[PDB]
């Protein structure tokens, strides 16, 4: 019942920071077909829009 505040602090540090966004946005873009073919799973699939969760 106290962990959500920790996640919120992490987001305060990261989610809206311009340096973090410039470091992560548009980096390592993979298409859904390429992700499916290369054998990716989990977030690496769901980051490309694939709706799949075991």
């Amino acid at each position: 019942k106290n962990f959500s505040f920790r996640i919120d602090e992490l987001e305060e540090m990261l989610t809206n920071n311009r340096i973090w966004r410039n470091r992560t946005v548009d980096i390592g873009v993979v298409t859904a077909e390429d992700a499916l073919n290369y054998g990716f799973s989990g977030v690496m699939l769901r980051g490309s829009g694939i709706q799949w969760d075991l």
Partner: protein, 71 residues
């Protein structure tokens, strides 16, 4: 005799747990921030206007004294 006793939740369950993202907006408009910046710039400009004019007068006075002492 004794009934079973193992780790179980209390009757009625546990209290609700927060999981939604909580990123409150502190609150100040961009217009307001720009207005504050411009206002403090203008106040500094006026104060330094006055001080620099006074400094010009002081320098002129020092030059007057030097001119008087020169011969």
């Amino acid at each position: 005799a004794s009934k079973v006793k193992q780790d179980m939740p209390p009757p009625g369950g546990y209290g609700p747990i927060d999981y939604k993202r909580n990123l409150p907006r502190r609150g100040l408009s961009g217009y307001s921030m720009f207005a504050v910046g411009i206002g403090t710039l203008l106040f500094g400009y006026w104060s330094m206007m006055k001080w620099n004019r006074e400094r010009r007068r002081l320098q002129i006075e020092d030059f007057e004294a030097r001119i008087a002492l020169m011969p």
